[PDB]
């Protein structure tokens, strides 16, 4: 959150200033490069042609889209042309469905028989990442931190203080990020070891 690098730190269902005093059941850091303009399609509910074949999102997503410009890294002095779009597919992907594929798309009446041409399109094409690439069409790095916040016991926790336990007085507790106010008492209740 404090970083001088990030060009976007957009977050959904969590604030980035509250994020460091919270805990998550897991976190998945979904990482890739795009042309910088395409950040508009890296957002929940946006009707993205790149999104539907490369990196989809839930319309009801919880996470942060942490992106930075990396022209000064990835665009080699001899020109970079390493990374690929995906331009076509039969249909839209599900909310985080990756789908590695080798298949020609047909956009009309022509038969393609697993070999390309006019009307017979392969899914991928070069990102032109010249070191002289102006502003918007540059290599932009992205990590989409997806945050899961399930009722399951948490595993990825903020760097919080760990207070001493007190029993039989009123306190404003926070256990694994689950938080409220009450009288806490040790109790007889036979929790099974997995509960």
């Amino acid at each position, epitope marked *: 959150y404090n970083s001088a690098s990030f060009s976007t730190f957009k977050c959904y269902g969590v604030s980035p200033t509250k994020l460091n005093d919270l805990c998550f059941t897991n976190v998945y850091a979904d990482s890739f490069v795009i042309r910088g303009d395409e950040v508009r399609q890296i957002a929940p509910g946006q009707t993205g042609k790149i999104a539907d074949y490369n990196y989809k999102l839930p319309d009801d997503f919880t996470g942060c889209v942490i992106a930075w410009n990396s022209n000064n890294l990835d665009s080699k002095v001899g020109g970079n042309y390493n990374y690929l779009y995906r331009l076509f597919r039969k249909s839209n992907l599900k909310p985080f469905e990756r789908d590695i594929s*080798t298949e020609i798309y047909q956009a009309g009446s022509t038969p393609c028989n*697993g*070999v390309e*041409g*006019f009307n017979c399109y392969f899914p991928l*094409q070069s990102y032109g990442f010249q070191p002289t690439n102006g502003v918007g069409y540059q290599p932009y790095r992205v990590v989409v931190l997806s945050f899961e916040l399930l009722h399951a016991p948490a595993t990825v926790c903020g760097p919080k203080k760990s207070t001493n336990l007190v029993k039989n007085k009123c306190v404003n507790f926070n256990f694994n990020g689950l938080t409220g106010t009450g009288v806490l008492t040790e109790s007889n209740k036979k929790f099974l070891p997995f509960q």
Partner: antibody
Amino acid sequence: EVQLVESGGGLVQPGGSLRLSCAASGVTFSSYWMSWVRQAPGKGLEWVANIRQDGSEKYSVDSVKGRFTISRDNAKNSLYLQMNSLRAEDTAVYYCARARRADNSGYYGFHFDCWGQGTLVTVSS
Amino acid sequence: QSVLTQPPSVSGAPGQRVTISCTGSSSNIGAGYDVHWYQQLPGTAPKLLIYGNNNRPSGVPDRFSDSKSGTSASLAITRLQAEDEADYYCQSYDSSLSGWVFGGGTKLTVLG
């Protein structure tokens, strides 16, 4: 059929310079943009280059980097080769026959569309 | 630098059988990219023998079958006849290079 025909062969001194070309006869080149290829004499074909619609082209460091160049013109359905500092083993038949890059396209197994009849760089004193 | 090294000759009489090799490295034949071959006597066109690695190109007969794994391809001839006594080459992609990789050259042979 993509009937590819090579053209514009030449003979010049060692360390000289040339321009050469090949054309997809009567068939538009924008669907089938082939890279240059050649025999190494007495041996196999040698990797000269790849190509893409967008540019993004690469050449072999083994013999053709810093010497060969690649371009096309769809008003003329022709590839071209602007070339500097001739070397003796350049002397062979050149065909212009497959299009898809180092990055995979077409399929993870290619098919090769048309090898023509050969144009020539030739080198001697 | 890298080459798909090929056997200089293998042999069968008229109507008989052969199966061959075209052998590179894990950086090419093992690196997911498949392999192709060309028949070419000097000044004949390079005649492509394989399509998709599941088919033969337009009009290329059943004797020109191929099989690929590990670090080698293995093209074939059944029903050898005299014009098959000729030069052939192979091709794929190599991740140790920028681009394409080529084979050592093969001569199929009718028997002595």
